[PDB]
Amino acid sequence: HAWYSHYVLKFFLLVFGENGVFFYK
């Protein structure tokens, strides 16, 4: 059972995604 496990994954994907999208030439 996990209802708040997607928030930590969705928020991380947004912050981790910008780290790669803002550093790939």
Experimentally, the structure was elucidated by NMR
Query: Which candidate, 23, 1, 5, 25, places its Cα nearest to that of 15?
Result: 23
Q: How far apart are CA 25 and CA 6, in angstroms?
A: 30
Question: What's the domain range around 20?
Answer: 1-25
Q: How far apart are CA 18 and CA 24, in angstroms?
A: 10
Contact residues for 16 (Cβ-Cβ < 8 A; gap 6+): none
Q: What are phi and psi of 17, to 5 degrees?
A: -65, -50
DSSP assigned state of 3 = S
What's the total number of domains in the chain? 1
Query: Which candidate, 24, 25, 3, places its Cα nearest to that of 16?
Result: 24
